[PDB]
Every structure is written in C-alpha cells, then in structure tokens.
Design a protein around this ligand. Structure first.
Ligand SMILES: O=C(O)[C@@]1(O)C[C@@H](O)[C@@H](O)[C@@H]([C@H](O)CO)O1
Ligand SMILES: O=C(O)[C@@]1(O)C[C@@H](O)[C@@H](O)[C@@H]([C@H](O)CO)O1
Ligand SMILES: O=C(O)[C@@]1(O)C[C@@H](O)[C@@H](O)[C@@H]([C@H](O)CO)O1
Ligand SMILES: O=C(O)[C@@]1(O)C[C@@H](O)[C@@H](O)[C@@H]([C@H](O)CO)O1
Ligand SMILES: [Mg+2]
Ligand SMILES: [Mg+2]
Ligand SMILES: [Mg+2]
Ligand SMILES: [Mg+2]
Ligand SMILES: [Mg+2]
Ligand SMILES: [Mg+2]
Ligand SMILES: [Mg+2]
Lengths: 174, 174, 174, 174
C-alpha cells in the first residue's frame, strides 16, 4: 500500500538522480567523428519542473561525464551537477553538508551497483525495473515505468502526492 | 463503438498536433557537439498527407522549439508551426481566429499536461497510451498505437473514415 | 503450411525492397545541424549477402532519398537503387525490362500503401507485422520479425530454403 | 540447472565478444554527413570491468570495423580488439596462441553465423535470444537479456559466480 511510501517521501527536500539507466535508458552512444549521444525523456522534464516548483532541490550524481548531462540539467534547473563520480553516497552526503540538509531529507534514484548505498541510506531510495537486483533489494520503491521512459516522472508525481502538491499542480492545467 | 467517434471527427477542418510524445516517442536527444536530435515515424507522414489532401489544415503546437520540427513540418505540409508555446488551447484558439474556424472544427492530439485543455476543449480531442492520465481522462479517443509509432497515422485514418475519404484514398494505391 | 510459400519463392531471380519500415523500423531522424539519420539491422545484411551469393539480384525501391540508403546498398551489393520513387510497381516493371526478367520472378517487400500493388503483383509479395492492413491483405507472406529487426533476414532465409540454398550456406559456417 | 554452466565457466581466462547484436542491439546507423553510429549498454560496461578486475582478459572479435568499437573497448579495458574479421574461431585461436591459453579457457559470445564455430569450440560458448538458431543450437548458454540490453552484463555475472568472485565484488558496493 502506497501510504507507506508517502510516509518516506513526506519530508524530502532534495531529489538526486543517477543519469545512465534512470534519466536515459542506459544506451551509451558513439559516432565515427568521436561524438557522444544520450537520450532523455520529455515527460521526465515536466515532472522534474513540477517537483522543483514545489521547492525541492534537484541534483545529478553520475559516474560518467558529458556536455549532454550539463545541458539537460541546465534546462530543467537541476542545480547541482556532480559528474565523473561513482561514489554516490559520499557525493550525496557532501551535498547534504553544503545545503544544511539531512540524508533523511534526500531522495535518491539509481539503477546499478554504485548507487546501492545511496539508495539504501537516503530517506527515500528508489530503483527501476531494469535495476540490478542488489540495488532493487535495498530500495524503498521500484518504479513501474523504466529508465528514460518515465521512471523519473513517476517518482516526481509520487513525491508531489506525498507532499500534497500534485493535485494543485495538475489543477493549473485544467 | 466507433460511430460515436466518427460523429466527433465528422466536421474537422483543422488537425493540430503536439510534437514530443505524439509525433516522436518522447525522446529528447543531445550530443557532445551541442547538437539535438528528434525521431519521427514514416507512416505518420503518409497519413498526414492523406488528411491534408482531403482538405484538412495541419498545424503543430509544441512547448519546445527546433529546426527538426520545422523541417518535418515543411516536408509534410504542416502549414502552421507554433513552437516554444506550452499554452496549447490559447494557441489553438488563435489559429481558429486567423483561419475563421470554430474549435468544434479543430482536432487536437497531445500526450501531457500542457495539452489537456486543448484536448478537452477541441471538437475532437485525442491522446495516446503513454499519455498522462489527466489528459487521457479528458480525451474523446485514445489511440491504440503509441507516439512516434503510428498514433498520428491512426488518427489520420480515423478522421478520413469519418469524412468518407479513406476508402477512396486507399483505392488510389490499388 | 510453408511449402505453399516455397512454391512462390521457388523461381525468384530478383529481390526488391522498400527501405523505410522494412530495412529500417520506420524512424525518420533529423538533427539541429540539418543532418538525417537512418538505422539498419546487422542480421539483414548477412541474409542479403546469402541471397545475393546464391545468384539473386538485389534492388531498392524507396519513396524517399538519402546517402544513407546508397551507402547501405553499396556495402551489401544491392545493385539497383531506385530512390525518390513511390510508384513501386512501375519501378519494378522497369527493372524487369532492363534485366530481361518476368514479374513472377520478382520478390517484393513493403510496409505501406505505395508498395501494395508491387506486393500484390510480384511473384512473391511480402509485408511485415506493422505493415498497413491493405498491403498485408494482398501479400503472400507476412514476416514474423518486424522491419529493421530481421524481417529481411527472415525473407532471405525463406527464399534460400525454397531454392535449396540455405542448408548449404549454413554449412559453410559449421 | 545452473551448476552445469558454472562447471563450464569455472576455468575461463579470456572472454571474447562479438560486437553487433551482442554489445549493441544490432542497429547499424548512418547519417547524411557520412557518419556512423553504434549504441552500447551502460550495465555491460560495469559487468565487463568486474570480470576484468577478477583477472579475466577481454577481447573483441567483430566482422565490421569502426572508431566506436575502439573507443568503447579502450574505456572498459577490452585489451585485444580484432575488427574487420568474420573468421571468429581462427581469430580466437590466434589470441589463444599469443597469450599461451587453451580454447577450453576461452569464453565466447556471438549472435550470428560467423560466430557459430567460435561459440561451439570455446570452453564456454554463449548466444542471445535474438541469435540465429544455428548458433543458439551450438551454445552452452543463451542469455535471458538481449544484445545491447545486458546480455553481456549477465554473462559477466555468470562467470564471476562460477569463479567465486561475484559476491565479493557486490560486497564492495555495500
Ligand atoms: O522535457 C522537457 O524539456 C519538457 O518536458 C519540459 C517542460 O517544461 C515542457 O517545456 C515540455 C514540452 O511541453 C514538451 O514539448 O518539455
Ligand atoms: O514520412 C514520410 O516522409 C513519408 O511517409 C511521406 C510519404 O509521402 C512518402 O514520401 C513516404 C515514403 O514512401 C517512405 O519511404 O514517406
Ligand atoms: O550488416 C552487415 O553489414 C553485416 O551483417 C554483413 C556481413 O557480411 C558481416 O560483415 C556482418 C558482421 O559480421 C557483423 O559484425 O555485418
Ligand atoms: O558503461 C560504462 O561506461 C560504465 O558502466 C562503466 C562503469 O565503470 C561506470 O563508470 C559506469 C557509470 O557508473 C554509469 O554512469 O559506466
Ligand atoms: Mg546508472
Ligand atoms: Mg540516434
Ligand atoms: Mg534509438
Ligand atoms: Mg508532448
Ligand atoms: Mg516503407
Ligand atoms: Mg544520432
Ligand atoms: Mg554479431
């Protein structure tokens, strides 16, 4: 039952995300001119702005590093962009310190092994259906939609509903 | 039963479309050289020309903005291209005024929250299986095929059949 | 039962293909620098070389036109490349005349309305699961695998088996 | 039962991979500027580093040839990169000789006909669900996940478990 999850999302002040496998579907794409490509999902962007609008801080913590991530983050107002960092919990804890925020007030979503401890230790830990078993085992919630296909949108809506901000947001479009 | 839907599509003079999640599958794609990519579906193009051929005006109303949209629109003869606009109903109403057309004569298709009011208020409102629930709740029809996979083709065929123009079009290929 | 289909593929001398929706999955892809992209399937290439090796002539007949098609055709030895042509039967008949070949000796595969007559009139006509109903209605065979996912590979294997050339080809890899 | 497979992976010293259809999902992608694209999977990379970390040598043997393969191989420490080579067994045997290693100590994964003999003859032979039947017929194991979607990750985990290295690796993330 969902109230158990709303209980966890209730006091989130910060939402941090892994990129590959969460914000994208995990494809790493190269071309013959040395150029790299990453694909994001349009409904995730709108869900992230909703969350962000309700006064939640958005962050990226990713093991890889690219201009694509920076660009996607900039247009959605994901305001703390940590790249080239696979020690996710350490990075999260570091953010917690510079914002004056507790881990219990952090939500984190990841698909693989570097994310497991951040997923486990955050107030609200999320993984995805194609997440590795070990990270899923340790999460508070597993999305229905998959990474780069509205897993993020889904969690945004969930946090909004827990904080009584979803229905009002919806209403602005009706 | 389908006649209920044909009753609604019967008097459409204008078909307006959201892009992301409707004409594409919702992927937003960036590369390391700062270049953006969007993917469309080939069967949608042919369905749009069929509609267009039968004397329906084609329009795009999209929250984002790109040369890809302009190019795709130009080759199919989507003749009114409104980009960087998320207030879809306002944009639709504006078109209705410059063409001398009523909303009841507009069909509109969208996948997410900015489209809900245009979907609700148009004579024929359409969403897609991966559309947000709120927009689907308010639509006259939900396509079987998904966005960027022939949702548009499907609605083109539907409007054509309602206007007794489909079978004749087909016949030109037989 | 399959022998009915082998009876039709038995005397094929030429295999002609539509591109979009057959050799690709139907995605039409543009980027912000004005560049177009198309995706093909690796197993189709090998199946086409097998067919080609057994002495069947390979041709493309496509409504659109691009350097991608030319390049893909060149590496597989698809030797007649007709682009910017939607009148597929006329184009096929034209090929039949310059090679001294009958239509009954042509196999053709297509997904949409411009292909229906070529599919109907060729000795062996093929469509795909996501083909429009009208073209599927008129085909001798509908592949199990979808376009850009081994529909072509599948038909190559089928023609090879009808001509007693498949098992031998396989054997060269064992 | 899985122990039968662990018995085969038990003594692997080298893991060799086909690229197209294994490391990618088989898409061959061209653009209008003459540029080629290939997509890899993020979870495969991490599984390959795990394997590699446990002291297994990683190799690529692919029929095609591109800078994308070289780049992907370089970042994961796939250390022997054989491209433009479809005679996979010969290439594998050649590697076996320059490293002083037996075939029984080689694991190989491939999706199509050029890989069948390497798959058959290696100590541990793997194919994928969308592999051609002939190669699947001759393999010791068929992955559950498909190519470019974690088939490789899956086999990495399997070899690790057979060599009692998986649980320990996992533990470093807990
Ligand atoms: O993914 C996006 O960029 C996003 O979802 C953000 C929204 O604010 C909005 O601009 C939306 C468009 O309506 C989609 O066309 O795109
Ligand atoms: O998507 C297209 O551009 C379209 O469907 C439009 C049609 O008019 C026709 O040109 C078609 C081609 O037959 C597809 O190869 O492409
Ligand atoms: O799609 C290809 O280019 C093809 O299937 C053609 C084959 O001849 C062969 O070169 C094959 C490679 O073995 C795939 O890596 O690619
Ligand atoms: O595919 C990758 O490059 C890989 O899986 C390799 C890992 O070592 C790690 O860097 C991982 C990132 O954590 C994914 O963001 O990427
Ligand atoms: Mg990840
Ligand atoms: Mg691409
Ligand atoms: Mg793609
Ligand atoms: Mg949209
Ligand atoms: Mg086609
Ligand atoms: Mg691209
Ligand atoms: Mg292969």
């Amino acid at each position: 039952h969902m109230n158990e999850i709303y209980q966890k999302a209730k006091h989130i002040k910060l939402f941090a995300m892994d990129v590959d496998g969460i914000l994208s579907d995990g494809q790493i794409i190269y071309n013959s001119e040395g150029t790299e490509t990453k694909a994001f999902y349009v409904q995730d962007g709108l869900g992230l702005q909703a969350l962000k609008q309700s006064g939640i801080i958005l962050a990226i913590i990713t093991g890889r590093s690219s201009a694509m991530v920076d660009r996607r983050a900039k247009e959605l107002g994901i305001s703390h962009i940590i790249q080239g960092q696979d020690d996710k919990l350490t990075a999260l804890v570091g953010l917690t310190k510079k914002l004056g925020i507790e881990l219990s007030h952090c939500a984190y979503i990841g698909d693989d092994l570097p994310d497991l401890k951040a997923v486990r230790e955050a107030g609200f830990g999320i993984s995805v259906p194609n997440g590795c078993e070990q990270t899923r085992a340790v999460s508070d919630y597993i999305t229905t939609k998959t990474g780069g296909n509205g897993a993020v949108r889904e969690v945004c809506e969930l946090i909004l509903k827990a904080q009584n901000n979803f229905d009002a947001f919806i209403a602005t479009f009706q």
